[PDB]
Amino acid sequence: RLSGEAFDWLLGEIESKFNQAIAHPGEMVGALAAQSLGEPATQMTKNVTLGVPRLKELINISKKPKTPSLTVFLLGQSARDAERA
Amino acid sequence: SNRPVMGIVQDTLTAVRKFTKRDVFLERGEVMNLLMFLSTWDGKVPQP
């Protein structure tokens, strides 16, 4: 139920806030990403081995992980009747 | 994570939960004593 003056003010505010939201040249986003990844790492921990060991496996690309696995989705009607799966 | 890192904690949090209940009533003396601590107060006492 907005009025014309309210709508004009709303458009001005939206444009101002969006222009404020742009990134700033010179920001060291690499260090920000590194810290935003590392800081949460200090509070977490069939088998999937989640947590810091999984982070090490992903970071250090290891030709053999601890628990490799595949999730397979059945294509035809076999996805419905376990007998034909 | 686009969220605050500083929040109200400890006794301040507990007492602000207790403070804003529906049945917290203050006489004028305590209201003046509390308003003495607002740095941004405009000097007008609200209607009770």
Binding site: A31, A34, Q35, L37, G38, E39, A41, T42, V52, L55, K56, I59 | V9, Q10, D11, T12, L13, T14, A15, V16, R17, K18, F19, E30, N33, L34, F37, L38, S39
Partner: protein, 192 residues
């Protein structure tokens, strides 16, 4: 500034009186624990008569442990819920938990209702001795109190065996704290 000065008028504390049930919730908790013990005894009896159908994808020992853990967790959750229902509006644990300032409902449950079941490496207490966990027990006992289920509450005090099992469960936290610091810093160093 405002709240810390209204608190001088209101005040806030915690004490023994804030960790007491009404002597009618105690009976409910005792009945729940008795029923849990009866259920685990029944499962053990049905196990030793080979009347236990293995759970899909689980061995016989695995499914036995699964039913045992399910019963014990049900007992702990029910006793904790009863303890929460028992608390008054003037209790201090409840006031400090509902505001999120400190603690959580599990802490209230462990202080009032029951400490719960101890674990190491995600499993019950292992047979450190030959086919038993302590010299005070008997060979090949898989009952609740012989594998680390702390029946009492922090208020009511722990019996010797439960105290030792609690110490075992506690040591794991210290070890994890020791290793997590050593790993996370290196990870972040390599990232940066």
């Amino acid at each position: 500034t405002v709240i810390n000065n209204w608190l001088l008028i209101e005040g806030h504390t915690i004490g023994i009186g804030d960790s007491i049930a009404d002597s009618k919730t105690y009976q409910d908790i005792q009945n729940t624990i008795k029923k849990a013990k009866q259920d685990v005894i029944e499962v053990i009896e049905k196990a030793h008569n080979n009347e236990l159908e293995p759970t899909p994808g689980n061995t016989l020992r695995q499914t036995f442990e699964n039913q045992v853990n399910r019963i014990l967790n049900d007992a702990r959750d029910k006793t904790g819920s009863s303890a929460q229902k028992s608390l008054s509006e003037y209790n201090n644990f409840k006031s400090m938990v509902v505001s999120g300032a400190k603690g959580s409902k599990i802490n209230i449950s462990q202080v009032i209702a029951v400490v719960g079941q101890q674990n190491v490496e995600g499993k019950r207490i292992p047979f450190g001795f030959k086919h038993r966990t302590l010299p005070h027990f008997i060979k090949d006992d898989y009952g609740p109190e012989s594998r680390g289920f702390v029946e009492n509450s922090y208020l009511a005090g722990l019996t010797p065996t439960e105290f030792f099992f609690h110490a075992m469960g506690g040591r794991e936290g210290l070890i994890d704290t020791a290793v997590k610091t050593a790993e996370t810093g290196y990870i972040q160093r390599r990232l940066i």
